[PDB]
Amino acid sequence: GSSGSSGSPEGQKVDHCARHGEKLLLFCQEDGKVICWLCERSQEHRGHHTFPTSGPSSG
């Protein structure tokens, strides 16, 4: 698999998934919420099309 990109507790906690702990930068359409990497690749949001929120930004 993959160890991860950010693995430090001193990291800017921004919309961190309370389930996995990964930063939520994606936006699921089917659900209309913000999910993380693991989530997206999870049977929960599997196949679901998500978009990069990039914080306070429309496009």
Question: How many residues touch Zn ion (CB under 5 A)?
Answer: 11
Does 31 help bind Zn ion (rule: CB under 5 A)?
A: yes
Rounded Cα distance, 56 and 46, in Å? 25
Specify the stretch interacting with Zn ion by CB under 5 A; choose among 3-11, 12-20, 51-59.
12-20
49 is in an annotated binding site: no
Spell out the long-range contacts of 39-48 with Cβ–Cβ below 8 A and sequence spacing 24 or more.
Answer: none
Contact 36, 22 (CB under 8 A): yes
Binding interface with Zn ion (CB under 5 A)? 17, 19-20, 28, 30-31, 36, 38-39, 45, 48
